[PDB]
Design a protein around this ligand. Structure first.
Ligand SMILES: Nc1nc2c(ncn2[C@@H]2O[C@H](COP(=O)(O)OP(=O)(O)NP(=O)(O)O)[C@@H](O)[C@H]2O)c(=O)[nH]1
Ligand SMILES: [Ca+2]
Ligand SMILES: [Ca+2]
Ligand SMILES: [Mg+2]
Ligand SMILES: [Mg+2]
Length: 166
């Protein structure tokens, strides 16, 4: 059927795996096990279309990011994730986007900016800051919590809707 290849990128510990696992398995992963490279596949109906999501969950740790490049090359849309309590992860976003443009050899790549951990109150990235960054990229900004499930489906489905506009 119609298959969408999604890739989740961002700094170590921002919740890439927890987000993907909440989407696919409907539970919250409380522990922190750094990822090398994992993939997930699930059939879902999105806006009346039965489709297959193939999701690549990438490493945020430099030491585990061995050869992310070749795996990412086939991605059709990218979730760029930072955590709203981690200013450094937000500052790193521009570098992740540049990496995506390098592996796709294009400046026209479907992406969504995601501010995760919105259940936490120690916020150092304000919504408007992230809205401004997304605006400069021509993409949407969405906040999520892998813990409460707020916005999780919205984030991934919005990315599918972005792929459909390209
Ligand atoms: N409160 C809260 N904690 C979260 C949220 N998302 C992830 N976490 C927590 O943050 C930690 C790291 O999550 P994880 O998904 O492993 O992060 P990652 O981005 O995949 N890390 P890596 O790049 O090393 O693979 C875990 O303890 C997890 O429970 C969230 O939305 N809210
Ligand atoms: Ca749990
Ligand atoms: Ca290239
Ligand atoms: Mg992970
Ligand atoms: Mg400030």
């Amino acid at each position: 059927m119609t298959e969408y290849k999604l890739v989740v990128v961002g700094a170590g510990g921002v919740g890439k795996s927890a987000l993907t696992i909440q989407l696919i398995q409907n539970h919250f992963v409380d522990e922190y096990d750094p990822t090398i490279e994992d993939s997930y596949r699930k059939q879902v109906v999105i806006d009346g279309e039965t489709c297959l999501l193939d999701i690549l969950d990438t490493a945020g740790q430099e030491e585990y990011s061995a050869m992310r490049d070749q795996y990412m090359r086939t991605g059709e849309g990218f979730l760029c994730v930072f955590a709203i309590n981690n200013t450094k992860s937000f500052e790193d976003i521009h570098q992740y986007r540049e990496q995506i443009k390098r592996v796709k050899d294009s400046d026209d790549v479907p992406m969504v900016l995601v501010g995760n951990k919105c259940d936490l109150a120690a916020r150092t990235v304000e919504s408007r800051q992230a809205q401004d960054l997304a605006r400069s990229y021509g993409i949407p900004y969405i906040e999520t919590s892998a813990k409460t499930r707020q916005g999780v489906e919205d984030a991934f489905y919005t990315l599918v809707r972005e792929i459909r506009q390209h």
